[PDB]
mmCIF file of C-alpha atoms in Angstrom:
data_model
loop_
_atom_site.group_PDB
_atom_site.id
_atom_site.type_symbol
_atom_site.label_atom_id
_atom_site.label_comp_id
_atom_site.label_asym_id
_atom_site.label_seq_id
_atom_site.Cartn_x
_atom_site.Cartn_y
_atom_site.Cartn_z
ATOM 1 C CA UNK A 1 0.000 0.000 0.000
ATOM 2 C CA UNK A 2 2.788 2.380 1.177
ATOM 3 C CA UNK A 3 0.152 4.760 2.618
ATOM 4 C CA UNK A 4 -2.197 2.703 4.831
ATOM 5 C CA UNK A 5 0.102 1.189 7.456
ATOM 6 C CA UNK A 6 1.575 1.852 10.885
ATOM 7 C CA UNK A 7 4.793 2.988 9.186
ATOM 8 C CA UNK A 8 3.000 5.962 7.612
ATOM 9 C CA UNK A 9 1.551 7.007 10.979
ATOM 10 C CA UNK A 10 4.983 6.766 12.612
ATOM 11 C CA UNK A 11 6.500 8.824 9.782
ATOM 12 C CA UNK A 12 3.828 11.492 10.275
ATOM 13 C CA UNK A 13 4.472 11.632 14.031
ATOM 14 C CA UNK A 14 8.232 11.891 13.505
ATOM 15 C CA UNK A 15 7.680 14.588 10.874
ATOM 16 C CA UNK A 16 5.575 16.549 13.378
ATOM 17 C CA UNK A 17 8.320 16.311 16.005
ATOM 18 C CA UNK A 18 11.044 17.276 13.514
ATOM 19 C CA UNK A 19 8.898 20.225 12.418
ATOM 20 C CA UNK A 20 8.859 21.344 16.057
ATOM 21 C CA UNK A 21 12.632 20.936 16.476
ATOM 22 C CA UNK A 22 13.422 22.786 13.237
ATOM 23 C CA UNK A 23 11.131 25.631 14.314
ATOM 24 C CA UNK A 24 12.869 25.725 17.708
ATOM 25 C CA UNK A 25 16.330 25.849 16.088
ATOM 26 C CA UNK A 26 16.811 26.020 12.298
ATOM 27 C CA UNK A 27 20.538 25.434 12.870
ATOM 28 C CA UNK A 28 19.596 21.855 13.762
ATOM 29 C CA UNK A 29 17.971 21.507 10.332
ATOM 30 C CA UNK A 30 21.110 22.939 8.722
ATOM 31 C CA UNK A 31 23.358 20.543 10.657
ATOM 32 C CA UNK A 32 21.136 17.563 9.821
ATOM 33 C CA UNK A 33 21.225 18.361 6.116
ATOM 34 C CA UNK A 34 24.980 18.922 6.171
ATOM 35 C CA UNK A 35 25.232 15.491 7.780
ATOM 36 C CA UNK A 36 22.700 14.207 5.270
ATOM 37 C CA UNK A 37 20.411 11.213 5.484
ATOM 38 C CA UNK A 38 19.297 8.516 3.011
ATOM 39 C CA UNK A 39 17.684 10.049 -0.071
ATOM 40 C CA UNK A 40 14.724 7.654 0.196
ATOM 41 C CA UNK A 41 13.393 9.874 2.997
ATOM 42 C CA UNK A 42 13.710 13.095 0.981
ATOM 43 C CA UNK A 43 10.137 13.202 -0.469
ATOM 44 C CA UNK A 44 8.848 12.123 2.947
ATOM 45 C CA UNK A 45 10.623 14.884 4.862
ATOM 46 C CA UNK A 46 9.941 17.540 2.226
ATOM 47 C CA UNK A 47 6.207 16.791 2.139
ATOM 48 C CA UNK A 48 5.725 16.124 5.856
ATOM 49 C CA UNK A 49 7.772 18.958 7.378
ATOM 50 C CA UNK A 50 6.633 22.520 6.583
ATOM 51 C CA UNK A 51 9.881 23.887 8.066
ATOM 52 C CA UNK A 52 11.906 22.748 5.033
ATOM 53 C CA UNK A 53 11.323 25.936 3.035
ATOM 54 C CA UNK A 54 14.217 27.325 5.109
ATOM 55 C CA UNK A 55 16.464 24.671 3.516
ATOM 56 C CA UNK A 56 16.668 26.861 0.395
ATOM 57 C CA UNK A 57 18.709 29.331 2.453
ATOM 58 C CA UNK A 58 21.668 27.045 3.160
ATOM 59 C CA UNK A 59 21.502 24.915 -0.011
ATOM 60 C CA UNK A 60 23.896 27.325 -1.845
ATOM 61 C CA UNK A 61 26.315 26.903 1.069
ATOM 62 C CA UNK A 62 25.864 23.114 1.052
ATOM 63 C CA UNK A 63 26.521 23.018 -2.706
ATOM 64 C CA UNK A 64 29.830 24.838 -2.143
ATOM 65 C CA UNK A 65 31.170 22.033 0.069
ATOM 66 C CA UNK A 66 34.148 20.024 -1.242
ATOM 67 C CA UNK A 67 32.563 16.666 -0.382
ATOM 68 C CA UNK A 68 30.850 15.088 -3.379
ATOM 69 C CA UNK A 69 28.220 13.424 -1.177
ATOM 70 C CA UNK A 70 27.147 16.760 0.305
ATOM 71 C CA UNK A 71 26.696 18.234 -3.176
ATOM 72 C CA UNK A 72 24.707 15.170 -4.295
ATOM 73 C CA UNK A 73 22.447 15.513 -1.257
ATOM 74 C CA UNK A 74 22.042 19.247 -1.894
ATOM 75 C CA UNK A 75 20.985 18.574 -5.495
ATOM 76 C CA UNK A 76 18.431 15.914 -4.507
ATOM 77 C CA UNK A 77 17.065 18.019 -1.631
ATOM 78 C CA UNK A 78 16.709 21.016 -3.939
ATOM 79 C CA UNK A 79 14.870 18.871 -6.494
ATOM 80 C CA UNK A 80 12.330 17.699 -3.918
ATOM 81 C CA UNK A 81 11.905 21.225 -2.516
ATOM 82 C CA UNK A 82 11.381 22.623 -6.024
ATOM 83 C CA UNK A 83 8.676 19.999 -6.520
ATOM 84 C CA UNK A 84 7.097 21.193 -3.270
ATOM 85 C CA UNK A 85 7.720 24.967 -3.193
ATOM 86 C CA UNK A 86 7.849 26.356 -6.740
ATOM 87 C CA UNK A 87 8.980 29.903 -5.955
ATOM 88 C CA UNK A 88 11.310 32.405 -7.679
ATOM 89 C CA UNK A 89 13.938 31.811 -4.984
ATOM 90 C CA UNK A 90 13.603 28.082 -5.681
ATOM 91 C CA UNK A 91 14.114 28.800 -9.390
ATOM 92 C CA UNK A 92 17.240 30.859 -8.677
ATOM 93 C CA UNK A 93 18.714 28.089 -6.523
ATOM 94 C CA UNK A 94 17.827 25.543 -9.232
ATOM 95 C CA UNK A 95 19.663 27.685 -11.791
ATOM 96 C CA UNK A 96 22.653 27.743 -9.439
ATOM 97 C CA UNK A 97 22.456 23.946 -9.136
ATOM 98 C CA UNK A 98 22.407 23.448 -12.913
ATOM 99 C CA UNK A 99 25.344 25.850 -13.277
ATOM 100 C CA UNK A 100 27.289 23.936 -10.614
ATOM 101 C CA UNK A 101 26.527 20.640 -12.378
ATOM 102 C CA UNK A 102 27.797 22.055 -15.666
ATOM 103 C CA UNK A 103 30.871 23.480 -13.951
ATOM 104 C CA UNK A 104 31.982 20.300 -12.231
ATOM 105 C CA UNK A 105 31.165 18.188 -15.287
ATOM 106 C CA UNK A 106 34.536 19.540 -16.456
ATOM 107 C CA UNK A 107 36.190 19.225 -13.037
ATOM 108 C CA UNK A 108 35.360 15.663 -12.029
ATOM 109 C CA UNK A 109 37.271 12.695 -13.375
ATOM 110 C CA UNK A 110 35.521 9.703 -14.932
ATOM 111 C CA UNK A 111 34.977 7.847 -11.651
ATOM 112 C CA UNK A 112 33.867 11.050 -9.934
ATOM 113 C CA UNK A 113 31.626 11.851 -12.922
ATOM 114 C CA UNK A 114 29.894 8.484 -12.559
ATOM 115 C CA UNK A 115 29.551 8.840 -8.783
ATOM 116 C CA UNK A 116 28.144 12.368 -8.988
ATOM 117 C CA UNK A 117 25.822 12.007 -11.958
ATOM 118 C CA UNK A 118 24.184 8.643 -11.283
ATOM 119 C CA UNK A 119 22.203 9.892 -8.197
ATOM 120 C CA UNK A 120 21.713 13.489 -9.350
ATOM 121 C CA UNK A 121 20.477 12.888 -12.912
ATOM 122 C CA UNK A 122 16.880 11.892 -11.900
ATOM 123 C CA UNK A 123 16.815 15.168 -9.949
ATOM 124 C CA UNK A 124 17.021 17.027 -13.275
ATOM 125 C CA UNK A 125 13.569 15.659 -14.125
ATOM 126 C CA UNK A 126 12.180 17.465 -11.074
ATOM 127 C CA UNK A 127 13.714 20.803 -12.106
ATOM 128 C CA UNK A 128 12.126 20.396 -15.540
ATOM 129 C CA UNK A 129 8.767 19.565 -13.942
ATOM 130 C CA UNK A 130 8.908 22.606 -11.664
ATOM 131 C CA UNK A 131 10.567 25.119 -14.019
ATOM 132 C CA UNK A 132 9.924 24.921 -17.782
ATOM 133 C CA UNK A 133 12.300 27.935 -18.246
ATOM 134 C CA UNK A 134 15.107 25.513 -17.320
ATOM 135 C CA UNK A 135 14.370 23.332 -20.385
ATOM 136 C CA UNK A 136 17.102 24.961 -22.481
ATOM 137 C CA UNK A 137 19.810 24.799 -19.804
ATOM 138 C CA UNK A 138 18.920 21.284 -18.645
ATOM 139 C CA UNK A 139 18.782 19.859 -22.178
ATOM 140 C CA UNK A 140 22.063 21.587 -23.058
ATOM 141 C CA UNK A 141 23.668 20.150 -19.920
ATOM 142 C CA UNK A 142 22.254 16.709 -20.731
ATOM 143 C CA UNK A 143 23.675 16.924 -24.255
ATOM 144 C CA UNK A 144 27.080 17.870 -22.836
ATOM 145 C CA UNK A 145 27.026 15.000 -20.311
ATOM 146 C CA UNK A 146 25.889 12.535 -22.964
ATOM 147 C CA UNK A 147 28.622 13.591 -25.380
ATOM 148 C CA UNK A 148 31.286 13.370 -22.650
ATOM 149 C CA UNK A 149 30.067 9.920 -21.647
ATOM 150 C CA UNK A 150 29.899 8.738 -25.267
ATOM 151 C CA UNK A 151 33.528 9.820 -25.651
ATOM 152 C CA UNK A 152 34.421 7.889 -22.505
ATOM 153 C CA UNK A 153 32.592 4.841 -23.876
ATOM 154 C CA UNK A 154 34.583 5.107 -27.110
ATOM 155 C CA UNK A 155 37.823 5.292 -25.087
ATOM 156 C CA UNK A 156 37.761 1.587 -24.146
ATOM 157 C CA UNK A 157 36.315 -1.657 -25.433
ATOM 158 C CA UNK A 158 32.868 -2.336 -24.002
ATOM 159 C CA UNK A 159 30.640 -5.356 -23.519
ATOM 160 C CA UNK A 160 27.594 -3.409 -24.783
ATOM 161 C CA UNK A 161 28.927 -0.493 -26.922
ATOM 162 C CA UNK A 162 25.901 1.875 -26.875
ATOM 163 C CA UNK A 163 27.504 3.976 -29.656
ATOM 164 C CA UNK A 164 26.500 1.440 -32.316
ATOM 165 C CA UNK A 165 22.976 0.899 -30.976
ATOM 166 C CA UNK A 166 22.141 4.542 -31.765
ATOM 167 C CA UNK A 167 18.479 3.945 -32.611
ATOM 168 C CA UNK A 168 16.960 2.025 -29.698
ATOM 169 C CA UNK A 169 13.304 2.360 -28.793
ATOM 170 C CA UNK A 170 12.155 3.030 -25.227
ATOM 171 C CA UNK A 171 14.074 0.240 -23.472
ATOM 172 C CA UNK A 172 11.931 -0.164 -20.373
ATOM 173 C CA UNK A 173 13.176 -2.338 -17.518
ATOM 174 C CA UNK A 174 23.593 -5.950 -14.096
ATOM 175 C CA UNK A 175 27.301 -5.595 -13.294
ATOM 176 C CA UNK A 176 28.055 -3.440 -16.322
ATOM 177 C CA UNK A 177 30.694 -0.838 -17.082
ATOM 178 C CA UNK A 178 30.208 2.512 -15.307
ATOM 179 C CA UNK A 179 30.314 4.420 -18.598
ATOM 180 C CA UNK A 180 27.610 2.435 -20.400
ATOM 181 C CA UNK A 181 25.535 2.610 -17.203
ATOM 182 C CA UNK A 182 25.877 6.394 -17.129
ATOM 183 C CA UNK A 183 24.982 6.585 -20.833
ATOM 184 C CA UNK A 184 21.839 4.539 -20.191
ATOM 185 C CA UNK A 185 21.028 6.756 -17.205
ATOM 186 C CA UNK A 186 21.312 9.872 -19.401
ATOM 187 C CA UNK A 187 19.005 8.265 -21.963
ATOM 188 C CA UNK A 188 16.501 7.293 -19.266
ATOM 189 C CA UNK A 189 16.397 10.734 -17.638
ATOM 190 C CA UNK A 190 15.930 12.370 -21.056
ATOM 191 C CA UNK A 191 13.065 9.928 -21.693
ATOM 192 C CA UNK A 192 11.500 10.832 -18.335
ATOM 193 C CA UNK A 193 11.833 14.555 -19.093
ATOM 194 C CA UNK A 194 10.177 14.106 -22.498
ATOM 195 C CA UNK A 195 7.362 11.854 -21.231
ATOM 196 C CA UNK A 196 6.525 14.290 -18.427
ATOM 197 C CA UNK A 197 6.346 17.122 -20.959
ATOM 198 C CA UNK A 198 4.177 15.050 -23.340
ATOM 199 C CA UNK A 199 1.951 13.142 -20.855
ATOM 200 C CA UNK B 1 -11.233 44.812 -18.749
ATOM 201 C CA UNK B 2 -11.644 48.591 -18.970
ATOM 202 C CA UNK B 3 -14.874 48.380 -16.957
ATOM 203 C CA UNK B 4 -13.021 46.387 -14.289
ATOM 204 C CA UNK B 5 -10.257 49.021 -14.233
ATOM 205 C CA UNK B 6 -12.747 51.871 -13.824
ATOM 206 C CA UNK B 7 -14.747 49.988 -11.190
ATOM 207 C CA UNK B 8 -11.646 49.277 -9.106
ATOM 208 C CA UNK B 9 -10.684 52.951 -9.440
ATOM 209 C CA UNK B 10 -14.176 53.780 -8.164
ATOM 210 C CA UNK B 11 -13.647 51.180 -5.413
ATOM 211 C CA UNK B 12 -10.442 52.748 -4.128
ATOM 212 C CA UNK B 13 -11.974 56.219 -4.605
ATOM 213 C CA UNK B 14 -15.395 55.615 -2.978
ATOM 214 C CA UNK B 15 -15.792 53.009 -0.191
ATOM 215 C CA UNK B 16 -19.569 53.643 0.027
ATOM 216 C CA UNK B 17 -19.752 52.505 -3.648
ATOM 217 C CA UNK B 18 -18.363 49.024 -2.801
ATOM 218 C CA UNK B 19 -21.840 47.506 -2.252
ATOM 219 C CA UNK B 20 -23.324 48.610 -5.590
ATOM 220 C CA UNK B 21 -20.120 47.712 -7.480
ATOM 221 C CA UNK B 22 -20.022 44.248 -5.967
ATOM 222 C CA UNK B 23 -23.656 43.738 -6.999
ATOM 223 C CA UNK B 24 -22.805 45.361 -10.378
ATOM 224 C CA UNK B 25 -20.017 42.879 -11.095
ATOM 225 C CA UNK B 26 -22.234 40.053 -9.847
ATOM 226 C CA UNK B 27 -24.674 40.935 -12.632
ATOM 227 C CA UNK B 28 -21.929 41.722 -15.159
ATOM 228 C CA UNK B 29 -20.337 38.266 -15.036
ATOM 229 C CA UNK B 30 -23.617 36.312 -15.034
ATOM 230 C CA UNK B 31 -24.358 37.914 -18.430
ATOM 231 C CA UNK B 32 -20.879 37.779 -20.013
ATOM 232 C CA UNK B 33 -19.158 34.457 -18.977
ATOM 233 C CA UNK B 34 -17.517 33.990 -22.390
ATOM 234 C CA UNK B 35 -15.835 37.406 -22.330
ATOM 235 C CA UNK B 36 -14.533 36.897 -18.777
ATOM 236 C CA UNK B 37 -12.918 33.513 -19.561
ATOM 237 C CA UNK B 38 -9.781 34.920 -21.294
ATOM 238 C CA UNK B 39 -9.663 37.739 -18.707
ATOM 239 C CA UNK B 40 -9.755 35.211 -15.809
ATOM 240 C CA UNK B 41 -5.979 34.422 -15.837
ATOM 241 C CA UNK B 42 -5.467 38.080 -16.764
ATOM 242 C CA UNK B 43 -7.090 39.006 -13.425
ATOM 243 C CA UNK B 44 -6.251 36.175 -11.006
ATOM 244 C CA UNK B 45 -2.515 36.850 -11.622
ATOM 245 C CA UNK B 46 -1.985 33.087 -11.911
ATOM 246 C CA UNK B 47 1.644 32.629 -12.857
ATOM 247 C CA UNK B 48 2.126 29.626 -15.199
ATOM 248 C CA UNK B 49 4.901 27.866 -13.245
ATOM 249 C CA UNK B 50 4.976 29.543 -9.807
ATOM 250 C CA UNK B 51 2.717 29.345 -6.775
ATOM 251 C CA UNK B 52 1.691 32.967 -6.356
ATOM 252 C CA UNK B 53 1.273 34.773 -3.042
ATOM 253 C CA UNK B 54 -2.173 34.535 -1.466
ATOM 254 C CA UNK B 55 -3.893 37.919 -2.021
ATOM 255 C CA UNK B 56 -5.388 39.895 0.858
ATOM 256 C CA UNK B 57 -8.853 38.415 1.477
ATOM 257 C CA UNK B 58 -9.993 41.803 2.885
ATOM 258 C CA UNK B 59 -9.062 43.797 -0.265
ATOM 259 C CA UNK B 60 -12.432 44.924 -1.764
ATOM 260 C CA UNK B 61 -11.060 45.164 -5.335
ATOM 261 C CA UNK B 62 -9.861 41.559 -5.195
ATOM 262 C CA UNK B 63 -13.134 40.409 -3.598
ATOM 263 C CA UNK B 64 -15.022 42.031 -6.477
ATOM 264 C CA UNK B 65 -12.754 40.331 -8.995
ATOM 265 C CA UNK B 66 -13.732 37.008 -7.412
ATOM 266 C CA UNK B 67 -17.440 37.924 -7.369
ATOM 267 C CA UNK B 68 -17.270 38.682 -11.107
ATOM 268 C CA UNK B 69 -15.257 35.532 -11.911
ATOM 269 C CA UNK B 70 -17.617 33.335 -9.853
ATOM 270 C CA UNK B 71 -20.794 34.707 -11.375
ATOM 271 C CA UNK B 72 -19.225 34.058 -14.781
ATOM 272 C CA UNK B 73 -18.133 30.548 -13.672
ATOM 273 C CA UNK B 74 -21.798 29.617 -13.024
ATOM 274 C CA UNK B 75 -22.374 29.263 -16.788
ATOM 275 C CA UNK B 76 -18.850 28.203 -17.801
ATOM 276 C CA UNK B 77 -17.407 24.724 -16.972
ATOM 277 C CA UNK B 78 -13.985 25.884 -18.219
ATOM 278 C CA UNK B 79 -13.690 28.504 -15.442
ATOM 279 C CA UNK B 80 -13.407 25.991 -12.492
ATOM 280 C CA UNK B 81 -10.294 24.591 -14.215
ATOM 281 C CA UNK B 82 -8.285 27.839 -14.266
ATOM 282 C CA UNK B 83 -8.792 28.442 -10.510
ATOM 283 C CA UNK B 84 -5.708 28.372 -8.317
ATOM 284 C CA UNK B 85 -5.601 26.612 -4.929
ATOM 285 C CA UNK B 86 -6.204 29.792 -2.941
ATOM 286 C CA UNK B 87 -8.924 30.688 -5.468
ATOM 287 C CA UNK B 88 -10.777 27.493 -4.426
ATOM 288 C CA UNK B 89 -10.154 28.318 -0.750
ATOM 289 C CA UNK B 90 -11.418 31.889 -1.177
ATOM 290 C CA UNK B 91 -14.445 30.615 -3.127
ATOM 291 C CA UNK B 92 -15.463 28.271 -0.301
ATOM 292 C CA UNK B 93 -15.469 31.257 2.092
ATOM 293 C CA UNK B 94 -17.370 33.837 0.016
ATOM 294 C CA UNK B 95 -20.026 31.274 -0.866
ATOM 295 C CA UNK B 96 -20.812 30.988 2.846
ATOM 296 C CA UNK B 97 -20.232 34.647 3.792
ATOM 297 C CA UNK B 98 -21.666 36.328 0.651
ATOM 298 C CA UNK B 99 -24.091 33.762 -0.809
ATOM 299 C CA UNK B 100 -26.212 36.607 -2.221
ATOM 300 C CA UNK B 101 -23.294 37.744 -4.408
ATOM 301 C CA UNK B 102 -21.397 34.477 -4.956
ATOM 302 C CA UNK B 103 -23.345 31.663 -6.658
ATOM 303 C CA UNK B 104 -23.115 27.948 -5.986
ATOM 304 C CA UNK B 105 -20.651 26.307 -8.343
ATOM 305 C CA UNK B 106 -20.055 22.788 -9.613
ATOM 306 C CA UNK B 107 -16.458 22.212 -8.518
ATOM 307 C CA UNK C 1 59.613 39.924 4.429
ATOM 308 C CA UNK C 2 57.806 38.347 1.462
ATOM 309 C CA UNK C 3 59.660 35.002 1.420
ATOM 310 C CA UNK C 4 57.446 33.490 4.122
ATOM 311 C CA UNK C 5 54.595 32.796 1.639
ATOM 312 C CA UNK C 6 52.075 34.170 4.162
ATOM 313 C CA UNK C 7 49.122 33.765 1.797
ATOM 314 C CA UNK C 8 46.295 31.286 1.214
ATOM 315 C CA UNK C 9 45.887 29.431 -2.080
ATOM 316 C CA UNK C 10 42.703 30.213 -4.026
ATOM 317 C CA UNK C 11 40.726 27.219 -2.742
ATOM 318 C CA UNK C 12 37.827 27.634 -5.130
ATOM 319 C CA UNK C 13 36.243 26.374 -8.324
ATOM 320 C CA UNK C 14 35.100 29.377 -10.369
ATOM 321 C CA UNK C 15 31.573 28.367 -11.356
ATOM 322 C CA UNK C 16 30.652 29.229 -14.942
ATOM 323 C CA UNK C 17 27.263 30.621 -15.911
ATOM 324 C CA UNK C 18 26.907 28.263 -18.894
ATOM 325 C CA UNK C 19 31.408 35.127 -8.009
ATOM 326 C CA UNK C 20 30.207 31.850 -6.528
ATOM 327 C CA UNK C 21 32.827 29.131 -6.185
ATOM 328 C CA UNK C 22 33.118 25.620 -4.759
ATOM 329 C CA UNK C 23 35.589 25.445 -1.886
ATOM 330 C CA UNK C 24 38.420 22.938 -1.471
#
């Protein structure tokens, strides 16, 4: 069910308490999000805790951190917040996030590129859903990432070689290469962006 | 649109005219639903991709814009669609508080 | 007096538009 169970009630109670604690001290919310938590709880916390609109204040600071995991968490948190609170400040922070993604696309190595872009690419669907003005920047960034990853695929011999496929239909759903996996992830997030904007 | 502009000018200019201008717009929308339908997002300030701020529920000009848009909505299925969330909330209130100006709708 | 290298390296990643920087 995922909605009609004791787990949902417990999540609501915990969200109420966390709402109270964040109201009492927003610095606790900032510290918790700098620590991070599993991203499976992100829609839960964003929907169930009204205090999270303050998270847009320290997301630009969290993005600036040198840890890759903190930046990944900032991107995912911003995506969920943008889904919840579609505001001009949210749009500005989303623009900053896309700019940061484009910037460190040319800073991260191949392993770092895989590690950063596998969790944060589905978040780009949320920015497109919330902000149609980001269509140009997000599609341009996706084209850049796809071209970089296609180059990386061409660098070495591959078990799949997605370069020569080139014409696949919607391949709806293993221990594969990171580069072909990232290529497939780019294709899938582009498909999700298109389907949302056409259905 | 020009009538709305002049009526809101005469709303901010003459408070004692509020009653007759509310009633006026109640009758104006009931007659012209088709002409109000393009002007509905022109007046509600519904941004396409942003949740807009909730307008002051005590502002007489705004309350008269809702009266007009709700009397027009009575004849126009397509008007309930373009309502924002706060528009539905505000509707539920002025139907109870001002049932003689606001008509029952089919939301 | 300048040989001590009493300065801090520019620990930043100048973020391109298409000011703000990512610390190191």
